[PDB]
Amino acid sequence: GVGLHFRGAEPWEEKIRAAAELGVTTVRLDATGPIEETVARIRAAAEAGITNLVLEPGPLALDELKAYRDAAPDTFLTVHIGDNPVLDDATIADIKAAGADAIGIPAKNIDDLIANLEKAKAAGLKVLVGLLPGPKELVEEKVRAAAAAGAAALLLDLSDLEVAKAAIRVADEAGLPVLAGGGFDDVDSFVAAAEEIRALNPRATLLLEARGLATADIVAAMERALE
Amino acid sequence: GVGLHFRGAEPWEEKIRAAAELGVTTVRLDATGPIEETVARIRAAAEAGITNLVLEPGPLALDELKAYRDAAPDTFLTVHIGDNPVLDDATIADIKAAGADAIGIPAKNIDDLIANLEKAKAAGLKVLVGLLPGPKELVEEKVRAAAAAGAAALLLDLSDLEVAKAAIRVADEAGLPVLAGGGFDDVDSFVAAAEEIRALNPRATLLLEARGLATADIVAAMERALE
Amino acid sequence: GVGLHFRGAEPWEEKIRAAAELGVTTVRLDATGPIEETVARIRAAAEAGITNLVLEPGPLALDELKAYRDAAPDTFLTVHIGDNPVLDDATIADIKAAGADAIGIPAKNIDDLIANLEKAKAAGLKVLVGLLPGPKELVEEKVRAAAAAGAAALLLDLSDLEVAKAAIRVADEAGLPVLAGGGFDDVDSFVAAAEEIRALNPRATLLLEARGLATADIVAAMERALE
């Protein structure tokens, strides 16, 4: 016997609560959709025990920023700016004015990485530096540059696992926390890599892409990695 | 030469009709979306020859229930209640009043499984008992409990294939039909597992997750398993 | 450390521009959605340097056709008719009247393939013939029929890679360009198959399914295949 299953798109709140009960504390959240559902998700994360929250919104007015901050006032809120490496002193103030605990800045080259780190740290913001996939030697140099120029944490979207291990190992040398993702929608591949990352860098968190997985499979993935 | 393909989301009706022509008779349908498209899908399933239909709606008023029943009056309609293991005698009547041939009940523990089976069977409803993924010994005990307490069929959302084979083998011992799914979006992995499930339990149906696959690939998957 | 990532759906324009900068020139675009976002995507493809554009719309009025043609007047626009193998002389005129450089026609059997090729070529349209997955010998005969009856190019939606290689090799014998896809959402499997297709047929383009992949991973996929 063979049949068809048309599985429904599960609410993100259910997935957030299921993971947090197992002990998950970090969620990287896309905040480009409508405000009402984004705020609702953040509130559920706050109730579930999510202590580290990384928003990735699109255009972000100060109204949106305060709404997100108020949706989880006791969490470590990090606002990711997106794509454009330009960092005007105005948008820094808005993220600062809303109570964000940190700002997320992409790293295309190192010269703008140093300038952005100077701008945001001078304005009292902790900085989470993100690296785009690239050659292994270049990524290592950017990890060192981010570390030396005062980054609080590293965001690694490196689907090349071997390159990612290299960057994570360099970050561990500097005692840099790492948020790692990329190419992890399979359950079995994730739990294997979650054991490897832990050995390379104890301060490193691996992110499961949870948008398309069933809640039960997320629980299975988190159970096998945490335990 | 390399290029980009932005494939469009295909209507579920096309996929239902394509599978039914090959001989597929069981469809597990998410019924959380708008009523008009859900009813339209059910009607196409009725025209295509779908004889076993498992709805998984969200909130479900009696108006929705009768609409679904009338969309395919000659099919074996099973209404799945969702998540909350509480089973009030009122929602049982509504599913009964609408002409549903069976009700779908989750099994978190065995004590509420026995109580829910008593409640629904006393009210003349056939019961399809669903099992969440868990330890192999626990799943087997729940299969035995469901079988002994009068379940008409088992729903297995077990992504751990080896555990799923264990539950399916225990169900075969009791002559229990099984609807099985979980982690089957790949074509090649599905057809392999479809041959294994058949040997373990002739009364067992394996469900292909069809939400993201092309219609041609669904036809290829069903052709290789049925033949 | 383990966490959740809820990645946002990235605009198709970003993916189109990222690929075109690497040198990609062919995009197969679903044109069933609203006109405004479809036209916006086509314009971005025109600006990015996409010279071969294959639209796959649903119902298509002449208003839609001219809008798409005007969104990229310097590109080789191919309009794919969809599913129904019937080819009335009226819809041929509308595609012709809008300035389309070619028409896409499915091939269920060979007799309607010959008739449709006669109809569209007599009306001055270049024809891109698409083949549905099937037995290896049948596909080869259809490639020969399409080639002998005057097809300008072949569209291959063959998830069975070995069958696809057979059709591509037969097309190379006749000097037929090929657009190939099917089952390519994984990065590593795509780049491997992109090297094999090139050897079999230099005039053959392999399409990456880009709807669900991150822009960075698309860049990684295109970099490894082009170089």
Q: Is A28 on the interface with C (CB under 8 A)?
A: yes
Contact B207 A6 (CB under 8 A): no
Residue C50 is which amino acid?
I
Residue A91 is which amino acid?
T
Structure tokens at A188: 């079995």
CA distance B174 to B170: 7
Q: B127 and B103 in contact (C-beta within 8 Å)?
A: yes
Structure tokens at C215: 């822009």
Q: Is C220 on the interface with A (CB under 8 A)?
A: yes
CA distance B10 to A216: 26
Residue with tokens 């191919």: C78
A221: closest CA of chain C, how far (Å): 9
Q: C179 and C26 in contact (C-beta within 8 Å)?
A: yes
Contact C6 A211 (CB under 8 A): yes
Side-chain-side CA neighbours of C46 within 13 Å: the count stands at 16
Residue with tokens 């037929």: C176
Burial readout B78-112 (b: 16 or more C-beta within 10 A, e: otherwise): bbbbbeebebeeebbebbbebebbbbbbbbeebee
Of A1, A6, A219, the CB nearest to B205: A1
Question: Phi/psi zone of residue A182: left (φ > 0), alpha (ψ -120 to 50 degrees), beta?
Answer: left
Task: Check residue A193 and report its DSSP letter.
Answer: H
C186: closest CA of chain A, how far (Å): 9
Contact B5 C25 (CB under 8 A): no
CA distance A173 to A147: 10
**Of A75, A30, A8, the residue nearest A48 (C-alpha):** A75
- Sign of dihedral through CA atoms C69, C71, C74, C76? negative
- Does A7 map to a domain? no
**Of C181, C174, C124, the residue nearest C153 (C-alpha):** C174
Structure tokens at A15: 């997935």
CA distance B22 to B28: 17
Contact B28 A8 (CB under 8 A): no
CA distance A208 to A213: 9
CA distance C150 to C171: 12
- Does B4 map to a domain? no
B93: closest CA of chain A, how far (Å): 25
Instruction: For residue A83, give Cα distances in angstroms to A56, A60, A101, A104, A184.
Output: 10, 13, 20, 10, 22
Enclosing domain of residue A154 = 12-226
Task: Check residue A132 and report its DSSP letter.
Answer: -
CA distance B8 to B212: 10
In total, chain C counts a number of residues equal to: 227
Instruction: For residue A145, give Cα distances in angstroms to A81, A128, A170, B213, C119.
Output: 20, 13, 11, 43, 64
Beta partners for residue A131, in sequence order: A107, A156
**Of B41, B83, B27, B40, the residue nearest B60 (C-alpha):** B83
Kindly state the helix (H) or strand (E) to which residue A22 belongs, with its residue range: helix A12-22
Chain A residues in contact with B194 (beta carbon < 8 A): 2
Kindly state the helix (H) or strand (E) to which residue A136 belongs, with its residue range: helix A136-148
Contacts with A99 (C-beta within 8 Å, 6 or more apart), sequence order: A66, A69, A73, A77
Strands (E), A8-64: 26-30, 52-56
Q: A170 and A201 in contact (C-beta within 8 Å)?
A: no
Nearest residue in chain B measured CA to CA from C57: B8
Q: What CATH number corresponds to the domain at position C119?
A: 3.20.20.70
- Does C135 map to a domain? yes
- Does C66 map to a domain? yes
C218: closest CA of chain B, how far (Å): 9
Q: Is C21 on the interface with A (CB under 8 A)?
A: no
SS3 sequence of chain C = CEEEEECCCCCHHHHHHHHHHHCCCEEEEECCCCHHHHHHHHHHHHHHCCCEEEEECCCCCHHHHHHHHHHCCCCEEEEECCCCCCCCHHHHHHHHHCCCCEEEEEECCHHHHHHHHHHHHHCCCEEEEEECCCCHHHHHHHHHHHHHCCCCEEEEECCCHHHHHHHHHHHHHCCCCEEEECCCCCHHHHHHHHHHHHHHCCCEEEEEECCCCCHHHHHHHHHHHHC
Of A5, A187, A216, the CB nearest to B207: A5
Question: Phi/psi zone of residue B175: left (φ > 0), alpha (ψ -120 to 50 degrees), beta?
Answer: left
Contacts with C58 (C-beta within 8 Å, 6 or more apart), sequence order: C31, C32, C82
Residue C168 is which amino acid?
I
Q: B28 and B207 in contact (C-beta within 8 Å)?
A: yes
Instruction: For residue A59, give Cα distances in angstroms to A55, A63, A70, A155, A180.
Output: 12, 11, 18, 20, 24
SS3 sequence of chain B = CEEEEECCCCCHHHHHHHHHHHCCCEEEEECCCCHHHHHHHHHHHHHHCCCEEEEECCCCCHHHHHHHHHHCCCCEEEEECCCCCCCCHHHHHHHHHCCCCEEEEEECCHHHHHHHHHHHHHCCCEEEEEECCCCHHHHHHHHHHHHHCCCCEEEEECCCHHHHHHHHHHHHHCCCCEEEECCCCCHHHHHHHHHHHHHHCCCEEEEEECCCCCHHHHHHHHHHHHC
Contacts with A41 (C-beta within 8 Å, 6 or more apart), sequence order: A12, A13, A16, A29, C6
**Of C227, C223, C172, the residue nearest C197 (C-alpha):** C172
- Does B3 map to a domain? no
Q: How many domains does chain B have?
A: 1
Q: Is B211 on the interface with C (CB under 8 A)?
A: no
- Does A4 map to a domain? no
Q: C64 and C35 in contact (C-beta within 8 Å)?
A: yes
Structure tokens at A14: 């259910």
Contact A12 C1 (CB under 8 A): no
In this complex, which chains have at least 3 CB pairs below 8 Å with chain C?
A, B
CA distance A212 to B43: 27
Gaps in chain A (C to N distance exceeding 2.5 A) after = none
Contact C24 B5 (CB under 8 A): no
Beta partners for residue B2, in sequence order: C206
Contact B4 C25 (CB under 8 A): no
Neighbours of C18 (CB within 10 A): 19
CA distance A150 to A148: 6
Look at residue A44 and give its three-state secondary structure. Answer: helix
Task: Check residue A50 and report its DSSP letter.
Answer: -
CA distance A64 to C57: 36
Q: C117 and C143 in contact (C-beta within 8 Å)?
A: no
CA distance B194 to B212: 19
Q: Is B27 on the interface with A (CB under 8 A)?
A: yes
Q: C43 and C71 in contact (C-beta within 8 Å)?
A: yes
Kindly state the helix (H) or strand (E) to which residue A78 belongs, with its residue range: strand A76-80
CA distance B9 to C111: 30
Instruction: For residue B29, give Cα distances in angstroms to A7, B68, B77, B186, B191.
Output: 7, 11, 11, 19, 21
Structure tokens at A54: 């990384």
CA distance C223 to C212: 18
Neighbours of B227 (CB within 10 A): 7
Cα angle at C91 between C88 and C95, to 5 degrees?
140
Euclidean distance between the first and the last CA atom of chain C, given in angstroms as a whole number: 36
Neighbours of C11 (CB within 10 A): 16
C214: closest CA of chain A, how far (Å): 9
- Does C27 map to a domain? yes
CA distance B161 to B152: 23
Contacts with A196 (C-beta within 8 Å, 6 or more apart), sequence order: A165
Residue with tokens 């979980």: B182
Q: Is C217 on the interface with A (CB under 8 A)?
A: yes
Residue with tokens 């929602």: B91
Q: Is A129 on the interface with C (CB under 8 A)?
A: no
Structure tokens at C90: 């009226």
Instruction: For residue B68, give Cα distances in angstroms to B28, B46, B65, B215, C144.
Output: 13, 11, 5, 24, 48
Residue B171 is which amino acid?
A
Task: Check residue A86 and report its DSSP letter.
Answer: -
Beta partners for residue A126, in sequence order: A102
- Does C127 map to a domain? yes
Task: Check residue A6 and report its DSSP letter.
Answer: E
C210: closest CA of chain B, how far (Å): 6
CA distance B117 to C137: 54
